[PDB]
Design a protein around this ligand. Structure first.
Ligand SMILES: Cc1cn([C@H]2C[C@H](O)[C@@H](COP(=O)(O)OP(=O)(O)O[C@@H]3C[C@](C)(N)C(O)(O)[C@@H](C)O3)O2)c(=O)[nH]c1=O
Ligand SMILES: Cc1cc2nc3c(=O)[nH]c(=O)nc-3n(C[C@H](O)[C@H](O)[C@H](O)COP(=O)(O)O)c2cc1C
Length: 407
């Protein structure tokens, strides 16, 4: 019955998601070290989740999905998976996040939007759609959509860091229009794996998250129909209202780092309890410091998730304010998660001692994986500080990171 600290799902659908996942932990857990050493994606893990209905966990119930719709419960499930393997959890988050955001498109967007959403969502439930996300351009390229002169579009460019890509059937891509007449827009084409000119590379070589499939994808004159395109707003047109969607789509990933911290602790404590001698002064002191820091990490992520779910559900008010507040809870918590979670994992290696310094020890992988959140937008630390200090001091700024990137 816990409602804090991400200790338990707060809804019956979240409870099912977590009980169902339990069945896959032994596989996820078992191929973790091999996939980390090789830098390869656990495709058999994802085949099993697909067949089990789990890749449709956040599709509305109305469409055949489990209907998990709390970010809190997604975070709880991701925390559980990340305790078994962080890379799998991170890949799964892209899919569960999409269930939530496509859900929103389905209930609230225009007819093109609702129709695309509904078709992808039903595919997610069926095990036919595995939806990847491509936001950041490779340095060599600016990803653009140009009119084909015939109703549809041609997508050229390259995205870097596209987790789950080796198994993705659908790729939601951040692109800017060009060669029309409007000021450039933000646009989200959806590319299917068999679109021509679309290539999935195999160049993911990570410090951590080595098994997350986080490769580049290339678009070369890719034909995209007009109705497979979610049009966004003009580049640099400031509406804080977009911040809500950008909170929905990443905030629950915080649970991955909370689970990595939890797994480091569980490992350290199991290591101490397996020892002949009674723990030393500094070992007892570390264990209490980590117990407390893990509690604060869980409560800070749990609390922002709770708040986000409440702000998310309320569409009655000022939508710009809703956006600002969502992003505020998310980024205040993220900054804390990105300091507490690596520090907890690092202190656990102090408890275990030099055994943790061999490539194969579980802590050695958790130390590497736990750093990943520091590099995920919105926002990495340097950008988080510009956003938070602007909010705190009421400084007007373009808070859309993709809008900025398009500049
Ligand atoms: C305004 C609003 C939008 N939305 C939704 C509908 C839009 O499709 C979406 C726009 O969000 P967003 O602009 O974040 O786009 P996205 O396609 O989700 O991309 C993200 C990028 C990220 C964070 N790196 C990720 O890879 O982890 C993945 C999973 O996706 O946000 C809401 O759910 N609630 C809202 O109140
Ligand atoms: C391990 C890892 C995986 C990532 N996966 C994605 C992704 O699937 N989609 C995306 O838009 N960005 C992803 N990013 C991008 C970051 O959000 C950011 O723009 C920089 O590193 C990822 C970053 C890292 C470090």
């Amino acid at each position: 019955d816990s409602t804090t600290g991400l200790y338990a799902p707060v809804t019956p659908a979240g409870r099912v998601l977590l009980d169902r996942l339990a069945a896959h932990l032994p596989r996820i857990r078992s191929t973790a070290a091999e996939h980390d050493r090789d830098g390869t994606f656990p495709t058999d893990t994802f085949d099993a989740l697909r067949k089990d209905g789990l890749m449709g966990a956040t599709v509305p119930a109305e469409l055949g999905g489990l209907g998990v719709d709390r970010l809190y419960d997604v975070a709880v499930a991701l925390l559980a998976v990340a305790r078994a393997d962080a890379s799998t959890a991170l890949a799964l988050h892209m899919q569960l996040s999409r269930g939530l955001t496509l859900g929103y498109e389905w209930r609230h967007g225009d007819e093109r939007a609702r129709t695309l959403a509904e078709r992808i969502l039903r595919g997610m439930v069926a095990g036919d759609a595995v939806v990847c996300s491509g936001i950041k351009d490779h340095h060599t390229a600016v990803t653009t959509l140009r009119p084909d002169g015939a109703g549809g579009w041609l997508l050229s460019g390259r995205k870097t860091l596209v987790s789950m890509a080796p198994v993705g059937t659908h790729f939601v891509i951040n692109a800017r229009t060009d060669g029309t007449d409007g000021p450039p827009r933000l646009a989200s084409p959806v590319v299917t794996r068999d679109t021509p000119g679309f290539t999935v590379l195999d160049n993911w070589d990570g410090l951590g998250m080595r098994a997350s499939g986080t490769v580049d994808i290339v678009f070369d004159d890719c034909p995209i129909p007009a109705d497979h395109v979610l049009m966004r707003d003009p580049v640099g047109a400031r509406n804080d209202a977009v911040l809500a969607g950008q909170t929905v789509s990443s905030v629950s990933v915080l649970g991955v780092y909370v689970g990595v911290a939890q797994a480091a602790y569980d490992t350290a404590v199991a290591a101490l309890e397996r020892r002949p001698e009674p723990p030393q002064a500094a070992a007892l002191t570390l264990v209490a410091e980590i117990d407390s820091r893990l509690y604060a990490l869980r409560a800070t992520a749990g609390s922002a998730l709770t708040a986000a779910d409440a702000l998310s559900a309320d569409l009655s008010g000022d939508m710009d304010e809703r956006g600002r507040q969502m992003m505020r809870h998310f980024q205040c918590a993220k900054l804390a998660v990105n300091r507490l979670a690596p520090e907890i994992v690092s202190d656990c290696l102090s408890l275990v001692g030099g055994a943790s310094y061999t490539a194969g020890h579980p802590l050695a992988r958790l130390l590497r994986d736990v750093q990943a959140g520091r590099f995920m937008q919105p926002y990495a630390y340097v950008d988080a500080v510009d956003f938070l200090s602007a909010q705190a001091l009421g400084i007007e700024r373009d808070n859309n990171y993709m809008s900025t990137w398009a500049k």
